[PDB]
Structures are given as structure tokens and as C-alpha cells.
Structure 1
Amino acid sequence: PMLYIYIKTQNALVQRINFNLDSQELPQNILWIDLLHPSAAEIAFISSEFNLEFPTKEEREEIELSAKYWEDNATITINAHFLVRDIKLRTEIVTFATAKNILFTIRYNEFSTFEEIQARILASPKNFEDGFDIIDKMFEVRVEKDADLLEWIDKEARRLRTSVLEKKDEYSYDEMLKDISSLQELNMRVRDSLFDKRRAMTSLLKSDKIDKDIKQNLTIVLKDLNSLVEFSVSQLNILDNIQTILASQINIE
């Protein structure tokens, strides 16, 4: 049950404070508040200090569980999509929220993609003026990590493509089918993860809480995201065709 507060320092750098809710005093110049394994104390803390609640039924608005983006006059909420090990992956969701120009992330597990997000924010030369600048950089880091995963699948697909097409350096036909099937699932999960981030960034673009600097950056990430979706689709066709060729060999032989 941990609470990390990221502040903009006097020297215009970011510093991470391991914050103790029950005793310590709140810092100045907060950029981003990270809640890991929150208990009712941490949930009570952000509500009492930043007016941040998450009921699924309220009087003022119809809350739709069939969306992953919600915005009222003061806050934006995003249930953001991540992939974590279950190689077999599974969906992990992190709640993002904005209040008083501060980014909030609420997470229930620690996973490697979020550690990479932490390291990049702490080491970026970018000057973050508020929490909206943070989420801007996070979307960029998240699309890169999805790209690295498509690249890894690409390496594995080329090895399989060579092995099956030229019938050279093959192993167990069943084992090759297991791998192809595993890569197909990874490809499908990353593409869907990329679709989720497209919908969120596009909804952020419409907010008037987001200044022109962030909208320009989200647009650049969106173009690259689209490139990765194209790459993922070409890649899945290759995997499906390797599976078809491999099944053809089993049956013919």
C-alpha cells in the first residue's frame, strides 16, 4: 500500500516522495500522484483533498461502463489498458484521473511497463508543467512498448516463416503450431491495446482541459499508433498463413 508524489523541484526537475498519509505533510508543486495497492485510506485521501470519487451510479450523469473515458467540469477519468504476464499476457487496467492540474494513477499491481513509464518521466528532459504533461508522455512511452512487443513477435515470425516455408531447421510440428498460436494471441492483444489507446487519446483531444502543446503531441503519437496497427495486421496475416502452410504439411505428410 504505497503513495508516490511527484513534485516539480526548484531546479525544474522532478522528485519522487514516498509519502506517508497517516503522518507526513503534503508537498508543494505536485505534478502526479501514484497510488499502488490502495486501501480505503488512500482512496479517502484523494477524495478528501482532490474531490475524486468513482461511483458507477450518480445523479448528475449517466455513468456508462461501456466507455473507458469520463469527463465532467473538473476531472477527467480514464481506465487505461496495459498488458502484463499471466509467453502469455493478460489485461491489466490502471485508473488515470486529473484533478487540480494533477495526474492521478491508481494501480493494483506492479508491472514492468509501468516501471518503464516511471523511469522515463523521472529522466525526461521535458519540462512538465502539470499532470496533463505527464499523461502526454505516458501515452508516447506506452505506444513504444507496444511497438517493441510487435518487433519481438516479428523476430519470432521470421524464424518460423523461414523454418516452415523452406522446410529447413524445423522442430516438432506440434511445437511450432503452439508457438504460432502463442504469437497470434500476443498480436491480437497488442492491437486491441492500441485500439484502446486510440480511443482515449482521441477523447483527450476534445477536452478543453488539454492545452495546444499536448494535443500536438497526442496527434503525433496517434499517427505512430496507426502505423503499428497496420504493422500488426500484416503480421497477423503472416502468422495465419504460416499456420495454414504448417497444417498443410502435417496432413500431406
Structure 2
Amino acid sequence: MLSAFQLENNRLTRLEVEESQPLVNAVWIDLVEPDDDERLRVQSELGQSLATRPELEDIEASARFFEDDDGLHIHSFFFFEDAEDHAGNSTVAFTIRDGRLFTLRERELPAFRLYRMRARSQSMVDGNAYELLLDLFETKIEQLADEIENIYSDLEQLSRVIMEGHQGDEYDEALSTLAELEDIGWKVRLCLMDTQRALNFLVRKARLPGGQLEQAREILRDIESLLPHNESLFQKVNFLMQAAMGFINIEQNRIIK
């Protein structure tokens, strides 16, 4: 799946690519599970090699945040929920070269879907590939913060269910939900931590136009402010787990009596 976008008055407008062959006019090329026809098309029409599937698995800093003849590379976890509502992180390879942004990804993602919807009726400021990359990160953080907000409200309700060792079988259900909330929070943290590394790298490495530099710092500031929330949820979750076992053992005693 190949989509391309060009700029018109600092407004991202969707290029037709099946028909309007010239890719050279695009500021952003976005690939989702691209076949070899699409890869080769980018290779020949632009200068651009793209990362292979196993290179997106690499978690080492030097494999994710690096500069080379193919441009500036940032690989970053993006958060998603699979078909059975199980949280996950999907690595996206960002590449910036000659003022063009390339995003290579394994699947559809809610941040991208959201940014694209907004980009349809919303002006960029400086109108460049670095701004675009950060806009996508802004969007990511916005969603991560929404995830955390919902862990709180779900955990609040679940908390009240757990305050009785009244078991059968709203308690099997409670432990399961706890474990689902732990896992979401855990994966949100990985996503935040990784974006944090990515942005710290960017700040030291890319000439970032100054409007872009402040934007990046703003996102870093948001991340610094979300991480503690994440850590706070783990305490609560772990305590709730402990209390539940207490109630289960109290119940066991009742039963044996």
C-alpha cells in the first residue's frame, strides 16, 4: 500500500499514485506492508532504499537512531490494539532525506489514521518533513495520554469490584481485567520510553529548524509528564493484585469452615 502526499499552502494533500505517477512532488511517502513493486518504485523514482522487515525488529539504539547515505533514520514504537483487543507496539521506520519524509510500517495505525484525517483540513506551520515527523509524534503522545486516562477510569471501577471477596465468578473476571490493564500500561511505557530516546537523538543530531526544536521539546516535556502516571498505575495494579489474593484466602477459610 503506497500513499503519497504533497504540500499546497502548508496543507498536506493526497497525491493520486495509481494514476499521477510523478512521486518527485511528494513531501511524504507512506508505505504500509509494501510489496516489491512499491519498494522498487520508490528505489527508482527517488533515491530511496527502505528498511527490511527484520531490521524493524532491532531494538539497539544504533539500529534505530542513525544517519547514513540513505538519510536520517528514526525507528519508533507506535501503539495499537490487534483484532482481539490485545495491546501491542509496532515499529515504524521514519526516514528523512532531501526534505522528504518516508514512513514504512507493518500495519494500519491509529495515530496515522488520525493525523491524516486532521491533515485534510489543517495547515502546517513551516511545512517540512521534520515538522511532519514531529506532528506524527505529537499525535502518538496525544493517544498514549488518552490510553492512560482510560486505564485510570477502568482501574477505578475495577477497584470497587475487588473490595469484596465476593467471588463467584466476578473475581476470575477481575484478575483478568487487572492483567489486561497492566499489559496496556506496560506497552504504553515502552512506547513512551522509545519516543523519548528518539526525540533526544533528534535534538542533538538533526539540524532542526528552530520552530521544530521547540515542538520537539514540547513533546519531550509531555513524555516527562506522562511517565510518572504510568509508574503510578503499576503500584495500584500490584497492590490490587495483593488485596485480591487476601480476599481469596479469606474466602477459602470461610469455605473450609
Answer yes or no: same fold by TM over 0.5. yes
Residue 6 of structure 1 corresponds to which residue in structure 2?
5
Which of 132, 135, 154 does residue 133 from structure 2 map onto? 135
Which of 7, 11, 14 does residue 16 from structure 1 map onto? 14
Contact persistence 1:31–1:131 (CA under 8 A) = yes
The 2-side partners of 1:160 and 1:170 are apart by 15
Contact persistence 1:5–1:16 (CA under 8 A) = yes
Once the two structures are superposed, residues 18-54 of structure 1 have per-residue CA deviations (whole angstroms, 9 ceiling, x without a partner) of 312xx64315653211112211222122223332225
The 2-side partners of 1:225 and 1:170 are apart by 41
Q: Give the superposition deviation at 1:169.
A: 11
Once the two structures are superposed, residues 145-164 of structure 1 have per-residue CA deviations (whole angstroms, 9 ceiling, x without a partner) of 00011111111111112232
Give, as a single letter, the amino acid of the residue that structure 2 aligns with 1:48. S
The 1-side partners of 2:193 and 2:21 are apart by 40
The 2-side partners of 1:243 and 1:210 are apart by 46
TM (norm. structure 2) is 0.85
Residue 255 of structure 2 corresponds to which residue in structure 1?
none
Give, as a single letter, the amino acid of the residue that structure 1 aligns with 2:117. A
Residue 99 of structure 1 corresponds to which residue in structure 2?
97
Alignment size in residue pairs: 242
Residue 32 of structure 1 corresponds to which residue in structure 2?
28
Pick closer, same or farther for the CA change 1:168–1:143 going to 2, 3 Å.
Answer: farther
Residue 45 of structure 1 corresponds to which residue in structure 2?
41
Q: Is residue 2:163 matched to residue 1:165?
A: yes
Give, as a single letter, the amino acid of the residue that structure 2 aligns with 1:6. F
Give, as a single letter, the amino acid of the residue that structure 2 aligns with 1:66. E
Q: Give the superposition deviation at 1:126.
A: 2.8
CA RMSD of aligned residues (A): 2.4
Contact persistence 1:4–1:17 (CA under 8 A) = yes
Residue 71 of structure 2 corresponds to which residue in structure 1?
75
The 2-side partners of 1:108 and 1:213 are apart by 31
Give, as a single letter, the amino acid of the residue that structure 1 aligns with 2:5. Y
Q: Which runs of 5+ in 1 are unaligned?
A: 57-63
Q: Is residue 2:185 matched to residue 1:187?
A: yes
The 1-side partners of 2:121 and 2:234 are apart by 35
The 2-side partners of 1:182 and 1:77 are apart by 33
Q: Give the superposition deviation at 1:171.
A: 5.8
Q: Kindly, what percent of the aligned residue pairs are identical?
A: 24
Which of 192, 197, 200 does residue 199 from structure 1 map onto? 197
Residue 59 of structure 1 corresponds to which residue in structure 2?
none
Give, as a single letter, the amino acid of the residue that structure 2 aligns with 1:75. G
The 1-side partners of 2:74 and 2:215 are apart by 18
Pick closer, same or farther for the CA change 1:8–1:30 going to 2, 3 Å.
Answer: same
What SS class does the counterpart of residue 91 from structure 2 fall into?
strand
Contact persistence 2:11–2:124 (CA under 8 A) = no
